[PDB]
Amino acid sequence: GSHSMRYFHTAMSRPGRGEPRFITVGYVDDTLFVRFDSDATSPRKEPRAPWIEQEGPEYWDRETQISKTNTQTYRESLRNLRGYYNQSEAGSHTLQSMYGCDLGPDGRLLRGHDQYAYDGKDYIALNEDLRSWTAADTAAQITQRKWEAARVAEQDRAYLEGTCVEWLRRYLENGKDTLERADPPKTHVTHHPISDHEATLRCWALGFYPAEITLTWQRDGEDQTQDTELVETRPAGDRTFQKWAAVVVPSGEEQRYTCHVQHEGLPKPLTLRW
């Protein structure tokens, strides 16, 4: 019932290879729906999900202009950052940001976000109050000062409480057949001897959406946290995700182990055995 919209910006400098590349992608939950790439033959905001395609030419023009403006702003920010850190013109640097809204099940704003990282390090972030900033260091304190004078937080708050929520709600309605459909995991357990006296039990979850899932192994009802090998949830490429969890078990003791699966798409949580 909870949903979120998030835009992700990345600018990457590349001395000797032209101006910094700028990319934006936008997501509702785990679904990419729009992209922009300054390195594109003809840079524009482009649809990446069928439900956004119905937005008109005016939408795409405005969204594209925003991205073109951002390309320029982010390049200027990278120049500023280099100076803030006394860095040479030689190296390549990354500036990232993400912003957007989380709704609770009731469909009202639950939390807003607007935050930045430089070279993979948190730099500055809008606080949950949508009125103040947390700056990581003395460089970000400079940015904080400029943003307080520019009333940036007020702009974010207004966008986050208004436009962001309204359009996310619009997107959810337009894409409800997918965005509001949870697809449960298809699950099974495999068994692979490692030696004469131990075997791997692997619990599989496939074809699920959204990405959030819990997979655990129990031995005699007790959680096997430290002894469970869990892989990162991974995209299948058809919008769905996959995950597995494995434990090494003594030969003959397999019946002591249970796999437990929980996911939004499931009527009831599952308990699996080999």
């Binding site: 835009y7 934006t24 403006t69 702003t73 200027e76 930045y116 520019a150 940036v152 702009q155």
Partner: peptide, 11 residues
Amino acid sequence: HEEAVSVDRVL
């Protein structure tokens, strides 16, 4: 829909 930001939020 993105936020209509400008150069006043350059870092």
